Design a protein around this ligand. Structure first.
Ligand SMILES: CC(C)(C)NC(=O)[C@H](c1c(C(=O)O)[nH]c2cc(Cl)ccc12)N(C=O)Cc1ccc(Cl)cc1
Ligand SMILES: [K+]
Ligand SMILES: [K+]
Length: 90
């Protein structure tokens, strides 16, 4: 990409989560969304402490938004797919 420059409007749940890490917008690019999702993962400590490239999001809003209990941070296309479903593209 840039496919990452894609303009997007997050749906209410996703928008609430981004604003909780200080996102101050209703419309974003795909790369801004990932930045703030990465920062949410950090503050909630959902990344594997054993450093095995996995986010454990079960029993957390992210888990509910992504429809999985855990994901690899290396599956970039998978992550964008899970993100797009919580978004209206502009
Ligand atoms: C340690 C941890 C889990 C907080 N962060 C990452 O592994 C980030 C990462 C970023 C970042 O802002 O780069 N944003 C993310 C959003 C989600 Cl949901 C999960 C992980 C990341 N990443 C590499 O550095 C992996 C990665 C980068 C781009 C794409 Cl399209 C997909 C994965
Ligand atoms: K929603
Ligand atoms: K705008």
């Amino acid at each position: 990409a840039s496919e990452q420059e894609t303009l997007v409007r997050p749906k209410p749940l996703l928008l609430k989560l981004l604003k909780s890490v200080g996102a101050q917008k209703d419309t974003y690019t795909m790369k801004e969304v990932l930045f703030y999702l990465g920062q949410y993962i950090m503050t909630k400590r959902l990344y594997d402490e054993k450093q095995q490239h996995i986010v454990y999001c079960s029993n957390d809003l992210l888990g509910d938004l992504f429809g999985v209990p855990s994901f690899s941070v290396k599956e970039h296309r998978k992550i964008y797919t899970m993100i797009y479903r919580n978004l209206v593209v502009v």
